[PDB]
Design a protein around this ligand. Structure first.
Ligand code: NAD
Ligand code: NAD
Ligand code: UDX
Ligand code: UDP
Lengths: 309, 309
């Protein structure tokens, strides 16, 4: 049993991951940007080196899961000061800590680093494909790619031991609605309130249920390979177009699509994210159990409970 | 037509030379930098601070903006990374938000550091068609310049902003003060003029460019501005030399031997060779440097003797 730090530990993936790691008997400190009522929790703004160093003055960590971030492509454009300071300077503070202390780190990147690539998003597309294939389309995507490069330069210069993960389209319990969240919680919250929402038809995604993904994220402790990078998401065969996902939300809520406005495609948005999960299947026992239809049913149920509907 | 031009980083090395070249052509030029000075047509503005950026534009309308404001140098970037990311990236995003509102034309200062450790001809299209692993940026400073380029291209795509990117290479000459964080030329010159020891890492090659030549090329962008373009600006492909050759030119111009020099094989985490292609600057920007390294180094030795009395 390891001592583990989860930054962004009060977020959506963070909350789920902290619970998964604790269920495995790890000792886990959750750190995030606000005070909470949680146990084994500490506020630390990762932009502030003093507050990052204070996390490490208490105890030694074997593993650090670094999720602390400004999340979302349009959040990143609208709040870019917070984005760059948190996602990049915060990551560099974590790397300076890792170079001093020698913990193992799991860096949270994003499938947004593949840009608008139309082919199979294998991890080696960010190695052997022409650079123009994956040009990042928004500041958020660039912060995650800069993070990856900084992790590799730290490894080269100081022998730091880091695994990078590229999460994909995660949904499920502990993801609150806001207008800056992804499509699934937008669709569910709006459908639950009979409020109109837009479907941009011309795109496809693979959605991953958070309970599955954090199982895989937690498996990195059991087979940690310094220098590696993994796409972590659902299954290649779970790819759907956006109307298919909307129709699953509406069916689980029990209404038709009269509240839906159909548009052809969202500008400046990736068309398709056709992921390859073969490396996670190989090294991390990746084996997701909850496909979109069942996952959306569970997420509708959780939001009804959470919002006291 | 005489233009109204803003130069950020206008009290720095290239900035001071560029402001002078532009004013000599009869442009109206406001210089902006991080400190108060005695200079005329000068304003302090910290480009990290949006309010201070906005204030630059509340007085005057600018036709062209040369954006040089930056934390310069790979080792400076590692040692002062907070300042690096906030100035080089957040500052550039503030300038792009201003460009989106006001519609001025911008020249963005990147770096040949964006080519990483590439061993082939560093043509601009290496950052387009070559495998991404060929040019992985090796330090935070290099990443900030590549991030800036991507942000410029995303602004052009989303808002129709008109930007030319330049990749300066290894610039030297008058108005470059010595510090320990400067590049190899002023380090060699200053130390030699003071009989102070310095190291030569032999296993590298560079092409060095005299600043009065480079700013003539930078000023020429006003006369032929092609939205979306990117140019390497430096000396000539055939001015390539190994580091000992440059040391020997400095020592000869000072009038001493190399007893102050310690020879090492190669500098870790440092690009081996920067074999630049200037064919695009020759085509579009009348690039025609008059001052090769031998003569350039003589003139720079002369200027440092005057400055440091
Ligand atoms: N589908 C996905 O959700 C997805 C996809 C790709 C990448 N990611 C990445 O996975 C991670 C988790 O995403 P999420 O969906 O849980 O988002 P989230 O916003 O719910 O989680 C991020 C957490 O980081 C915290 N945080 C922000 N700035 C901070 C700071 N300065 N100091 C400390 N904490 C700070 C936030 O308060 C939040 O709780 C992020 O790194 C995100 O970029 C997620
Ligand atoms: N000199 C070279 O060989 C070379 C090579 C590649 C790229 N570049 C780029 O060219 C530009 C000029 O380089 P230089 O050699 O003249 O360096 P320099 O440091 O002399 O010039 C940069 C200037 O930016 C100013 N500055 C820094 N932070 C600022 C802030 N927040 N607000 C306002 N001003 C700020 C500095 O005070 C300085 O005067 C930089 O963008 C640099 O990265 C130079
Ligand atoms: O209201 C909406 C929102 C989104 N969509 C569509 O749903 C798809 C998914 O969009 P999301 O923004 O949820 O997800 P994206 O994959 O585009 O990026 C999102 O998830 C991955 C993260 O790394 C990014 O930061 C985040 O913005 C897109 O095709 C979008 O057009 C709608 O049809 N309607
Ligand atoms: O004291 C020094 C500093 C640098 N260099 C070498 O000079 C070259 C130019 O390095 P600089 O940092 O000036 O520029 P860059 O590497 O960023 O092009 C590199 O090969 C360095 O190894 C050197 O021999 N001695």
């Amino acid at each position: 049993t390891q001592r583990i730090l989860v930054t962004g530990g009060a977020g959506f993936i963070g909350t789920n991951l902290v619970n998964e790691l604790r269920n495995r008997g790890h000792e886990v400190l959750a750190v995030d940007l606000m005070h909470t009522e949680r146990e084994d929790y500490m506020r630390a703004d990762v932009r502030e080196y003093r507050q990052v160093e204070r996390i490490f003055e208490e105890d030694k960590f074997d593993y650090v899961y670094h999720l602390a971030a400004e999340y979302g492509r349009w959040n990143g454009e609208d709040y870019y000061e917070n984005l760059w300071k948190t996602n990049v300077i915060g990551t560099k503070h974590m790397l300076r800590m890792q170079e001093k202390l020698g913990f193992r780190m799991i860096f949270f990147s994003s499938a947004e680093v593949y840009g608008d690539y139309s082919g199979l998003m294998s991890e080696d597309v960010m190695v052997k494909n022409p650079i123009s294939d994956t040009y990042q389309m928004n500041d958020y995507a660039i912060t995650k790619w800069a993070g990856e490069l900084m992790c590799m330069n730290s490894a080269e210069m100081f022998g730091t031991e880091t695994v990078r993960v590229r999460p994909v389209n995660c949904y499920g319990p502990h993801e609150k609605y806001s207008p800056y969240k992804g499509f699934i919680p937008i669709f569910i919250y709006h459908a639950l309130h009979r409020k109109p929402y837009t479907v941009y038809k011309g795109h496809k995604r693979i959605i991953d249920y958070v309970e599955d993904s954090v199982r895989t994220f937690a498996n990195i402790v059991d087979n940690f390979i310094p220098g590696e990078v993994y796409n972590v998401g659902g299954r290649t065969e779970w790819e759907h177009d956006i109307k298919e996902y909307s129709d699953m939300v509406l069916e689980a809520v029990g209404i038709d699509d009269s509240i839906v406005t159909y548009r052809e495609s969202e500008p400046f948005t990736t068309k398709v994210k056709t992921m390859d999960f073969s490396k996670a299947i190989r090294d991390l026992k990746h084996d997701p159990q909850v496909p979109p239809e069942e996952g959306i049913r569970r997420t509708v149920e959780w939001m009804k409970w959470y919002y006291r509907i």
